[PDB]
């Protein structure tokens, strides 16, 4: 049974990830998101779509990744039931409405994203589409959640030569050579994300900007934060920081707790 377990509400959005509806689990009124993905658009499979494999690998009590509650196969599609925080806003819309974020808030958000991406990598999962559009803010708890694992892959140490994430977050070695390694490409996208948070939009729109190696700051940003961004956006992948080096960076120290973040910046 699928139409009897959940009450379907309005469409929340559609795109490369499929179509996602608001829903409620009938048994206990739990808020959920109901995500439909057409089979003809699923490139990678595992043992079910790769998206389901990856979501199951990262599922746990840890709150930094979206929780897959259940899934169903239909003749032409798969349906994924995801936890739904309420109230919620994705980080793209949040930055559009707020503009450039205060660095204390960017620090808290960026820290939580780093913890979530570390969790993915610990679980053998490479997300490959880290961006503000794919991060949800649980506004009451001040907790961020990664969503949209449909571009992801099993984490490996050899080279990737396929990519279907977001090009303006993709690294210059992908643009130039169609070759990247998982961790250093993730760090590049985290540099784009951090710039996005503290400047109000991403730094690069065009391939020539991505490979050019120049970061111009369009908002007042602290020297420490600029340093961390430029390090994550190093042109040479081996010149980028590890996740440990990012979290030990001086700009990242004294992070707010999630509930402190909600009370100061979200309530």
């Amino acid at each position: 049974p699928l139409e009897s377990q959940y009450q379907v509400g309005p469409l929340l959005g559609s795109g490369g990830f499929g179509s996602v509806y608001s829903g409620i689990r009938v048994s206990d009124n739990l808020p959920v998101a109901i995500k439909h993905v057409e089979k003809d658009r699923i490139s990678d499979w595992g043992e079910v779509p790769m998206e389901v494999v990856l979501l199951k690998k990262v599922s746990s009590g840890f709150s930094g990744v979206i929780r897959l509650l259940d899934w169903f196969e239909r003749p032409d599609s798969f349906v994924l039931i995801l936890e739904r925080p309420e109230p919620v806003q994705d980080l793209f819309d949040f930055i559009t409405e707020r503009g450039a974020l205060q660095e204390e808030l960017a620090r808290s958000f960026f820290w939580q994203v780093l913890e979530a991406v570390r969790h993915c990598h610990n679980c053998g999962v490479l997300h490959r589409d880290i961006k503000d559009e794919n991060i949800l803010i649980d506004l009451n708890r001040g907790e961020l959640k990664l969503i949209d694992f449909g571009s992801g892959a099993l984490l490996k140490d050899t080279v990737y030569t396929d990519f279907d994430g977001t090009r303006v977050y993709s690294p210059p070695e992908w643009i130039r050579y169609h070759r990247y390694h998982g961790r250093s490409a993730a760090v590049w996208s985290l540099g784009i994300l951090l710039y996005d948070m503290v400047c109000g939009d991403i730094p690069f729109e065009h391939d020539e900007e991505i490979i050019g190696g120049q970061v111009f700051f369009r908002q007042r940003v602290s020297s420490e934060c600029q340093h961390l961004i430029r390090w994550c956006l190093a042109l040479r992948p081996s010149d980028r920081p590890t996740f440990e080096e990012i979290q030990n960076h001086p700009w990242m120290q004294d992070v707010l707790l999630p509930q402190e973040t909600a009370e100061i910046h979200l309530h």
Binding site: G15, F17, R41, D129, K131, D164, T166, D201
Partner: peptide, 9 residues
């Protein structure tokens, strides 16, 4: 300056 979403997938 225009801010926009970007497709993936």
């Amino acid at each position: 300056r225009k801010r926009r979403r970007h497709p993936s997938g």
